[PDB]
Design a protein around this ligand. Sequence first.
Ligand SMILES: [Mg+2]
Lengths: 140, 101, 149, 132, 152
Amino acid sequence: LHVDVPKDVTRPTITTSDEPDTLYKRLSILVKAHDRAVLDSYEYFAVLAAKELGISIKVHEPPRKIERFTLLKSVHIFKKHRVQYEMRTLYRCLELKHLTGSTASVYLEYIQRNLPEGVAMEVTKTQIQQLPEHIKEPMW
Amino acid sequence: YYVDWRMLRDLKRRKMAYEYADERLRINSLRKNTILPKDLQEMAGDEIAALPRDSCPVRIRNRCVMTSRPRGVKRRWRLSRIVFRHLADHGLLSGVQRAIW
Amino acid sequence: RKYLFKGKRLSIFADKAFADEPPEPEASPSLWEIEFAKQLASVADQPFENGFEEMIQWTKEGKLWEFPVNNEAGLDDDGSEFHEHIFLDKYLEDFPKQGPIRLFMELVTCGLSKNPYLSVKQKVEHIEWFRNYFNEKRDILKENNIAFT
Amino acid sequence: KNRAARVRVAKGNKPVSYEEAHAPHYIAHRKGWLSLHTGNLDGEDHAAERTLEDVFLRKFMMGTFPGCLADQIVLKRRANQVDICALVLRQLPAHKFYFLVGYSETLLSHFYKCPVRLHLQTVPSKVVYKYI
Amino acid sequence: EKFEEKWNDILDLLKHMVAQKVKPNLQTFNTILKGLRKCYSLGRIPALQILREMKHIGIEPSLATYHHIIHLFYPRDLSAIKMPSLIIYDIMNELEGRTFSPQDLDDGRFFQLAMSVCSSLRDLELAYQVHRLLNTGDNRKLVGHDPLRKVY
Ligand SMILES: [Mg+2]
């Protein structure tokens, strides 16, 4: 729009609670896909988004898995003649660090909503909390 | 309409095994142990026998959902080798390709 | 001159020192109140302007998953607790306190505690089934020197 | 000889599309996948159910747009959303397409209990990759 | 037959609303102003008094409430175009930057009526204020339906 622009765009309401926030020491995001190029683009989108929100991120490529199975090519007899099929799974792991619970929800929502088709995520949150009040003091 | 009469009989076997699962579980537990009197175990062996034969879960056969083929089926997709090959060879299965190596 | 908020007013009403004294739902929503609300919604009813507004509407209606993904969204097993699922020996009080029936029911309640696919209500039904089963077999048990209830 | 998904040679007068021209062994090499879901990835479930929905969704779209499909449809699942991307010939009037989209979307959203959207790209005529 | 009697009657309903300890709502005032659009000549002073009382009571005027005052102060079939009223300028100043929500059934009507009044006065600066109000927040949702969206 050249001349017609919103004036005061309405923004969602974010209210700070009185409950303490979760503290994630680590947050591993393992995305899976049949296509490496999609993982490269999603890795670029996710790493850029993390750096723009202040999150610390590292990326590595877990070894790929290929599952192969054999089938009978003909409809009837001709046993020795087979056809083989495979499914290739590729992995990209986004290891985030030192995240509060508010930062991990907004980031995960943003990147999960933009997860391309054919891509599956496996978030592995690692929360850190104090010791139970009972355990703190030995009681007989 | 299901594919054939063989698929219809199997469908009924699958719905009657679901109905009698709790019953056959509770009764069969009384037999798979050595802690209860053998008189009770011999009697529970007859209560399970009296249940209808289609409740028995070993009479279910995995058939192709689209052609009702009894053998040659792949359990992850529930399709026969012939039907699976038609969808796979046309690019219609997500991520399935031919294996060249 | 024609000041919108400067000048004489009707003065039939007085300043509302008391405000909204009767509650808004004085009675359960009537057809008249339920329908007027639907008409107020149509006043601001405009078509979707982009894919965001469409997804916002689907989310408000439950059609689209909420994010971040929670695999247990809306999945509460009767608001139970861990101790309810794991400690099930309270329900074995009717059974004999010792003997073969106690030894068997202990194995039954041990498995039920390790069952993640059943609710507490379903687990109790398994225990109740055996209570009625052994009651029916009172005569066979008595021959074997086992006394039930 | 292999007869699977191979549009065999005629006498140079048969117009095959890009998808039809390539045999099964070119999948993941020259041509991609028509459906993209996460159900065939490693350690993922519900492959059987996603595949059955695809078979139906293709037969439904052919009958709902009879003779108006220039190429096979592309199915894209994201979260619980389903997206159907179909190349459709410009045979029917414009207003008729709005009817079939509203109908086919609502009908398939109440049948599979997901949000379903239809994406139609109109072509003047079938696109010919080569004459075989 | 007589407006003075008719107006005094409608006021009597309002006086019984205070005897019975019933407090008026936005719709109550909107209804009175919509009725006043019949008597353009004699409804001007009464209409302003209503809006002053609306604020004192604590009811917040909605877009519909101004839509009715505009109709009453800027008649479409206005022969006296020589010296039009200036209230439209004051209203827009009052509503500058505010965001509005659906709270009546005539909220959509306001924007289409306001733009029309700008064309009659041939004031393009006022048209920018009206459109500028439409862009603040989500006011765009109250432009109107198909008949009034294309007129605005
Ligand atoms: Mg067998």
